[PDB]
C-alpha cells in the first residue's frame, strides 16, 4: 500500500521537500481563521491509523494555538467548545514555526445516523463520552495524566488524586484488627 | 525555485498526446453504477462462459498495489493533488519499476473519465488494441522522459 | 523483480463471487415479487 510510503516520507521531517510543504501550508493557513472546517486531512496515513474514516459523520478541523495545559490539549478543548455537537476522538500535529504550532483534530458526529448505525463507531454516541478532551480522556490527555503501567507511573497509574484520598482515609471495620 | 523533487510537475504531456491518451482511456471506461445495476438485473431476470471485463484502474491504493508488481503498463498522475506527498514519490516509484508514467494536468479531468468527481491517478493493466497502447507509450516516453 | 508476495488468488482467474451473490439476491427479490424485470418495466412504461 501507498500509506507505508507516506509514513516513510513523513519520517524524514527535516527533508527539504517537507520543509517546503510545511512553509507553504503554514503561510496558506495564516490567511484563514484560527479555527475552520477542513475539507480533508493533510496527513491521510496519520488520520487513518488514528481511526479516521472517509464517511459521512467525520469532520476535520484545523486550529491554531499560540506557542509557549499542553498545546494539543488547548487545541482539543477549543475545538470541543466550538464543536459542541461533535465528539473529539484524536488529533495529530501538522505544522509548526517560530510563532505558532498547528494541529489537526478529527471529530465524529454522533447525531448522524451513519455513526449511530456503525457498530465500530457507535460507541462514541454513549453520553459517557461527552467532551472527552474536557476530562482528558483523549490520547494527549491520557498521556499528560501519566496513565501507564510500570514503576514509572506508580504514583500516577490511575488517578493522582485518588491515591492521596486512599492513603489519607482511615478504614475501620466492625471488629478492629 | 524549489527542491528538484518538487517542480517535476508543471512539465506535462503536450496537448496532442494528452488528447490521444484521453481518447484511448475513454474506451475502457468502467461500468458506471447505473449500467452495472441494469446489467446485473438483466442477468438475474434471464437466470430467473463469461469473458474477463476490461476497465481502467484509478484507485490510488489499488494502483500502487498494481504498481511495484510490474503489471501496470501506463499510469496517469494528476499534478494538482492537494496532499502533494501522495504523488511526489509515485513518479520515482514508476521510474524504479520501469513503468512509463505521464503527468496530466487536472485531477478533475482525470476523474471525469472514470465516473468519479476527482481521481488522483489512473493506470492500465489489461488491453483489448495492444499496438495502439504500445505506440502511445512510446510517444509519451519520447515526449516526456527524454525531454524532462 | 516485483517486491510483493501472496501469489495470485483464484478469484482473479475466476468470475467474481460478488457478482454471483448480487445476481442471486436479485433472483430472490424477483421470486418475492418486489423487483420487476426491465423487460416488464418496458411494458409497464405505457
Amino acid at each position: 500500500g501507498a500509506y507505508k510510503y507516506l509514513e516513510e516520507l513523513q519520517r524524514k521531517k527535516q527533508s527539504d521537500v517537507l520543509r517546503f510543504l510545511q512553509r507553504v501550508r503554514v503561510w496558506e493557513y495564516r490567511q484563514k481563521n484560527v479555527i475552520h472546517r477542513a475539507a480533508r486531512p493533510t496527513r491521510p496515513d496519520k488520520a487513518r491509523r488514528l481511526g479516521y474514516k472517509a464517511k459521512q459523520g467525520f469532520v476535520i478541523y484545523r486550529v491554531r494555538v499560540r506557542r509557549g495545559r499542553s498545546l494539543r490539549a488547548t487545541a482539543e478543548e477549543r475545538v470541543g467548545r466550538r464543536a459542541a455537537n461533535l465528539r473529539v476522538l484524536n488529533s495529530y500535529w501538522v505544522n509548526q514555526d517560530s510563532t505558532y504550532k498547528y494541529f489537526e483534530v478529527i471529530l465524529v458526529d454522533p447525531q448522524h445516523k451513519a455513526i449511530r448505525r456503525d457498530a465500530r463507531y457507535n460507541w462514541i454516541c454513549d453520553p459517557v463520552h461527552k467532551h472527552r478532551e474536557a476530562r482528558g480522556l483523549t490520547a494527549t490527555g491520557k498521556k499528560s495524566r501519566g496513565i501507564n503501567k510500570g514503576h514509572k507511573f506508580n504514583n500516577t497509574k490511575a488517578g493522582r488524586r485518588k491515591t492521596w484520598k486512599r492513603q489519607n482515609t482511615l478504614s475501620l471495620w466492625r471488629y478492629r484488627k | 525555485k524549489v527542491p528538484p523533487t518538487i517542480a517535476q510537475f508543471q512539465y506535462t504531456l503536450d496537448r496532442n498526446t494528452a488528447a490521444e491518451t484521453f481518447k484511448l482511456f475513454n474506451k475502457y471506461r468502467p461500468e458506471t453504477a447505473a449500467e452495472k445495476k441494469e446489467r446485473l438485473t438483466k442477468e438475474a431476470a434471464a437466470v430467473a462462459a463469461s469473458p474477463k471485463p476490461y476497465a481502467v484502474k484509478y484507485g490510488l491504493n489499488h494502483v500502487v498495489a498494481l504498481i511495484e508488481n510490474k503489471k501496470a503498463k501506463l499510469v496517469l498522475i494528476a499534478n494538482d493533488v492537494d496532499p502533494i506527498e501522495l504523488v511526489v514519490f509515485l513518479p520515482a516509484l514508476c521510474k524504479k519499476m520501469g513503468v512509463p508514467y505521464a503527468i496530466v494536468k487536472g485531477k478533475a479531468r482525470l476523474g471525469t473519465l472514470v465516473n468519479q468527481k476527482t481521481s488522483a491517478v489512473a493506470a492500465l493493466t489489461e488491453v483489448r488494441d495492444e499496438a495502439a497502447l504500445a505506440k502511445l507509450v512510446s510517444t509519451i516516453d519520447a515526449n516526456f522522459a527524454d525531454k524532462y | 523483480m516485483p517486491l510483493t508476495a501472496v501469489p495470485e488468488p483464484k478469484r482473479r482467474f475466476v468470475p467474481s463471487k460478488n457478482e454471483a451473490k448480487r445476481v442471486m439476491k436479485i433472483v430472490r427479490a424477483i421470486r418475492e415479487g418486489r423487483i420487476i424485470p426491465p423487460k416488464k418495466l418496458k411494458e409497464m412504461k405505457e
Binding site: 510510503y5 516513510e8 524524514k12 | 523533487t5 | 510483493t4
Partner: peptide, 24 residues
Amino acid sequence: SNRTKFVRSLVREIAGLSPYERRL
C-alpha cells in the same frame, strides 16, 4: 522485509539529506 527496505531506500533517495545530515 525486502519490500520495507526497498521503500526505505526509495524514501531516502527522494528526501535527500537533512540540513544536519548535509554537514557530513
